[PDB]
Design a protein around this ligand. Structure first.
Ligand SMILES: Cc1ncc(COP(=O)(O)O)c(C)c1O
Ligand SMILES: Cc1ncc(COP(=O)(O)O)c(C)c1O
Ligand SMILES: Cc1ncc(COP(=O)(O)O)c(C)c1O
Ligand SMILES: Cc1ncc(COP(=O)(O)O)c(C)c1O
Lengths: 454, 463, 454, 454
């Protein structure tokens, strides 16, 4: 067996792939072998399911390349990377109207993604709640967390830290966590409420303000003081620029912490998250670990330790080059694309929209389902498959709870998916509808949900 | 007439233009846009303030530069490790790596072809996952027995901070056997004294962070067998092989520390350490399906079915996994053996050479059978050469070297040690230069006695 | 022995480091080996001792890479490089107010640096002087040169060309060459006076005008006609832009030649110098050598012969992209940083400043010493060592002459050392002072002068 | 006026090329403007006149690019570059059989090229001679130097340092410095003899051994002790590999110093020279200057000061990757090309060869003239012009002395000019001959000498 690339004895990667390789191989052959199979990966340019950055900027590539060995945890050897990281924490804190620091540095940290940021926020919430119950001489025996249609990271948090997850069910007419149902789920064991400022499954915002009012009335009627952690994975880098009037952040007294993804609308490369706390009081010191460095010690509250500092550096690059002025324009461009697709798609079939890409309602996304008791001659699963044959990945999936029988299609508009590409999508969308119309036997065959978690 | 306080002033000599002071507005989110290339050069220029770690002998993390690794990482910047759907080849390469590492550690042959394990950001996450699984297995055993599960504890030696975090975050009592003069590590006797029915497991550190020595699981495994025999209490182990996991399999195959031992239910290691991968790569392997409680695994829907994942992080880059595979492919056992041996030769050389320069007692001398490629020593008790290791460390910094001097924990807290790490890139020629600067530092301290005792700050020791 | 990079038998560069290597080695291995140890060199970004360019410009790297084989002396094969070189000579001549050329080309040449430029200037001075003395049948074996705190290249000139060096001593209150002491050293054997327009050790300018007037009076009283050569290594590319009114160049009749460094404030990469002569009469033709080429013979006055033309090309790039407009802003930026540091440092200790970075007084540098009889609890040597531990190289050294007891600290502000970096230096400066204060035993230990020559 | 490249108002480099630009210009525009006119430079691949390296090696480009700012004189900031430089000096010393250092370091230095190397060697020669005459109570007012057909750098040395240059004339039947004529020119005022181990104009070696014998006899008959400096600009990196048995170096007692060009057959990029002294006694300490550094103090004997360290590094790269083994094969390849050309060219016309590319006679060069009283119907100048029309630069010029009536053609074979290219040259050579034969009126028209100095 020979290889046509190297014109030599074949070196299989699929063979003996269950055992650690025995011999050495020429460096450049190993590289070309791996490089060639990586072509099997998609480039995600036509993938409209993910929230994660997929566009390419030469400067970001250069910054990441230079940072490949810069250790985020090693403040001693990489002091400048550490300083840039502190700047970012302050800037994000400022973006979310966090109270002015006493010493001068905001309370918060960079993370690998929103998952870790949420875990940290969740543990802090659990610890503050525990300190309160013990002081009240009550049992910390069975904590619970109230939320709406949260992302899987919260299910993991609940599971891994033994907290009862009280998720308000998604239901026809009310897909999100409303004040009434939220209150019905709250009690003395509730460690906190987690509104999702940009629901993963639909793109809509769960507004913290009305929930905050309900929590104020709750403490007035029962004495039970409940706080909030905002999961703003996507919305945290949207609303501050295109809808400053929405009061969802630290302007609300009960919001003790907020988390968001830099690698989503924060525009940073994969591997960047953020979590900020209102003030020192919001973060139990018992969770912070202090390590020694030549220049004094620094407290850290993170799950990960050693990791590259490139994403933080790239995130800073975006903050510096764009500013509020730049982010507003970038974000608005995505909202224009989403709004356009919503309006245009509505003219093509009997659809009921859950999200239409409006800045005041949520993120740059379009989410719809077929109108009840209406049969256009295909399901959204069938349409999704036709679109894949044209290179597009437009996820079709079912919602949860009382709406377990509802099938929706979600389109995400992130940086890089410009108006020109949306127009092409519409062309292929129309072509797919005509094909389904000309080949009725297709209806009902496709029935597998697409990846919806990110 | 333009008051200095009402202006975004300052001319810049690089751009032949003005302003843009990262430190001035550093507390607020920037207001305006800036030319991309100017923002890039501004950031690129201050990154020069970071060290390159070539002369840093404190860290275990990879610091050498390989062109092919730079290319693989550059092409993987947007490849999402969690998105199996869009990046199927990256996911396949990742599964190969898990099987290869499992094979490396003698994990039993999979009943369905795929080993039980996962890639991680680093050893910290790997350890958390291993720790959670240990806690869950212990809990189930106890619940199946109708016993209380509210007082779990974990027995270990001089562990890395990630275990202190695990204990704190998951409410597990950490029973760390104290480091002490004459016994700095977890021995069978003290280990057993700390074990009971609430012990979720024992965590030997196969390559102690602070000294470089291996804690040998075999003797501890025998003690646990005797323990079960005398009490009926069945205790398992998780090996924290952050560094050793990619050393002993190549240069000391005969040390029995892995899955060859029945009680070892899981093992974790750092790819970005001696695994030779770029920062951001860890590994955790479980003996088999039984070793990993399914309640911890989450199954997500994909167009091709569903894949279960047990991880704390979600979205993140797949470049390090790919780079790690590149190392596995180009080196193999044959290549890793030569690479690791080269580091041991340097370490052994430094130990032997440094021993001739002062009254030192060595804790680690870079021997393959004893631990990792590191040198760890302290001044002999009651010996005053005319300086402390802190003073020596500072003199070496003036020569560009970062050789950490710090104190040991427990009841050995009065011990000041110096640790030298020998990782890929720190070749024999550089070790010779270190020796030259070491001797020059000693002569300077000898000629300037007033220096003794002044320096007294510990260096970063955690990695 | 094995190498952990190549995973093969070790190849040491120290073992047989005194004998020519016996065998071949794979090219790439040789490259990586050398590349890896070059990491032991500093990048000079935190080095505030040198005057030489240390910033990086992508365009300059490209021009230099393209010119690696372009031979400066081979006018025949590289006609365009030779043309660009001629343009630069004329532009520098124009910058220094040299009289308009008769034929059209200014009299001058590019050099490797100011050293060579000064040798050429020195030889021409010696020759012009000799031609005068020889006509009067007087001895020409005991020539002397009058100057102030000159750079080492003049000591080399004096030594290599057997010229008595009459250096006016540096002294408290009079660290530079003044008119009075200058005249006291002049006689019929003086080949010329060399004012240093930007003293290496302090940064101050020695003003040619007052010296020029003294020389006019000298000729009036004795008949002895003495000329000048301005060593403007640094000042030559500063004053013409930020202080045009200072009369130090060819506007002065006696100034027969001027030299300066392109690789200093000229902004060119290492390896570029310039020397210009007032006119043909100022340059003895006996020193010029004519070499034949296909297009005709070209004369040259240079110590070096074959060498690369990249630096000249890079220098032209700076001239073209900046112009007077651009150079003024670039140099002003450096002066602002220097002025800022001087003002800020003065608030931290009992210091006496010799140079405070004022455009009318000298170059962008800060030079100071501890006030006489003041004991802050440390020497500038101690402070310098503390700053090294923070990555900075701020030279502390002693002055010459009578000010031999004086120890100064000199900070150079060149392109790349922006305001933000100066702020960081101030932070580390303060940190160093606090450490010295908390550790008194450190005082007096350090006593080695740093490199001060460039 | 518009520019077709930038599609905007034209920017001319010609317009006011004699004045320093007044305004700024876009950097990328300035770069492209300069990049575009550099295309007017030749690449020298078909230039067979120069000895300087013109081939391109990717690793050398990388090493030079990395070293653009590394200052050769700043031992403090660039310790590793300084170390590599010391290794090179020792390796070159070893190559020339210099006595083993009484300490651990050979006596010598790197230079910009052979010119500076020769000046340093010449100065040392003059100083040693002066010291001796003084110790004999004799005058030192009329120093002279005996040599053969030397390169222009020695004419410069003689002129700049006031030494009478006694150059033995090139003559038909005696083009080089022979023992007899050398002795006729020697006296008590001779500072030394300079044999040229690879004559620039022809390529032949002047053998130091026979000359050395004559000088031994001279001291025996007169007591006058005369030393030598070998100008081995080209031969210094040829004979040690391809003809080790030729005794021309430090194996000869009288050879006190040797110089050679790294950027010639040393294979280094432009800007690299070397000069080695036999031992400390051979280098008068009065010429060495000691400068202080934090690491202590190092001595240097150099005309230049600040300059790039890249060539030294690239030179080290060649030493490391090739070794004696590699240089022998590289140099041999050039000799094979030269020998082939000589043998083939001899069959095309009535020629008399002065150099035929034989390793035992000289460097890889071919030098010939038309046989006396032979008229093939063209001059070598005519042939040279025809070859230029085919892209080749094969210099035709006259020899000096009474050989001023001798027109020769010299072909240099350096790295890169492989056998395949030589065959192409022969094709064009024959084509040129046929053209000249078919167009007789061309004979005698061309009469300008080509650049012959390097
Ligand atoms: C609301 C929400 N939270 C958390 C996550 C997980 O973010 P990450 O993948 O960056 O950890 C996602 C994708 C999300 O949409
Ligand atoms: C034994 C040990 N465990 C865990 C860690 C943490 O690994 P990481 O920094 O890769 O999370 C280290 C550094 C270590 O030495
Ligand atoms: C006043 C002065 N003259 C000459 C020099 C030497 O210049 P170069 O290093 O460019 O030869 C320097 C450094 C200097 O400061
Ligand atoms: C014999 C000889 N000496 C000196 C030189 C000048 O060398 P460089 O150009 O390197 O100064 C040459 C070209 C030469 O051929």
């Amino acid at each position: 067996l020979l290889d046509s690339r190297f014109g030599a004895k074949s070196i299989s990667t699929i063979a003996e792939s269950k055992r650690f390789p025995l011999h050495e191989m020429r460096d450049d052959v190993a590289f070309q072998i791996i490089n060639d199979e990586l072509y099997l990966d998609g480039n995600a340019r036509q993938n409209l399911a993910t929230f994660c950055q997929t566009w390419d900027d030469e400067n970001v590539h250069k910054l990441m390349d230079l940072s490949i060995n810069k250790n985020w945890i090693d403040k001693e050897e990489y002091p400048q990377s550490a300083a840039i990281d502190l700047r970012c924490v302050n800037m994000v804190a400022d973006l979310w109207h966090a109270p002015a620091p006493k010493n001068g540095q905001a309370v918060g940290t960079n993370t690998i993604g929103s998952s870790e940021a949420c875990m940290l926020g969740g543990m802090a919430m659990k610890w503050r709640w525990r300190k309160r119950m013990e002081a009240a001489g009550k049992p910390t025996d069975k904590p619970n967390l109230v939320c709406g249609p949260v992302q899987i990271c919260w299910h993991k948090f609940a599971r891994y830290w033994d907290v009862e997850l009280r998720e308000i069910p998604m239901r026809p007419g009310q897909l999100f966590m409303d004040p009434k149902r939220m209150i019905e789920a709250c009690d003395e064991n509730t460690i906190g409420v987690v509104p999702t400022f940009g629901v993963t499954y639909t793109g809509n915002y769960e507004f913290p303000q009305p929930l905050h009012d309900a929590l104020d009335k709750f403490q007035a009627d029962t004495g039970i003081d409940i706080d909030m952690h905002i999961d703003a994975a996507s919305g945290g880098f949207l609303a501050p620029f295109v809808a400053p009037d929405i009061v969802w952040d630290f302007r609300l007294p009960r919001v003790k912490s907020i988390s968001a993804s830099g690698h989503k609308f924060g525009l940073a490369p994969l591997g960047c998250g953020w979590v900020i706390w209102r003030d020192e009081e919001a973060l139990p010191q018992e969770l912070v670990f202090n390590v020694d460095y030549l220049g004094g010690q620094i407290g850290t509250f993170a799950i990960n330790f050693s990791r590259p500092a490139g994403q933080v550096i790239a995130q800073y690059y975006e903050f510096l080059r764009l500013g509020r002025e730049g982010y507003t324009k970038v974000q608005n461009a995505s909202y224009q694309v989403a709004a356009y697709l919503a309006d245009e798609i509505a003219k093509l079939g009997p659809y009921e929209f859950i999200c239409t890409g409006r800045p005041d309602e949520g993120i740059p996304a379009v989410c719809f389902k077929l109108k009840d008791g209406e049969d256009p001659g295909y399901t959204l699963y069938d349409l999704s498959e036709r679109l894949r044959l044209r290179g597009w990945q437009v996820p079709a999936f079912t919602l949860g709870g009382e709406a377990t029988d509802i099938v929706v299609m979600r389109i995400m508009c992130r940086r890089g998916f410009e108006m020109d590409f949306a127009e092409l999508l519409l062309e292929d969308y129309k072509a797919s509808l005509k094909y389904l119309s000309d080949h009725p036997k297709l209806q009902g065959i496709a029935q597998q949900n697409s990846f919806k978690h990110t």
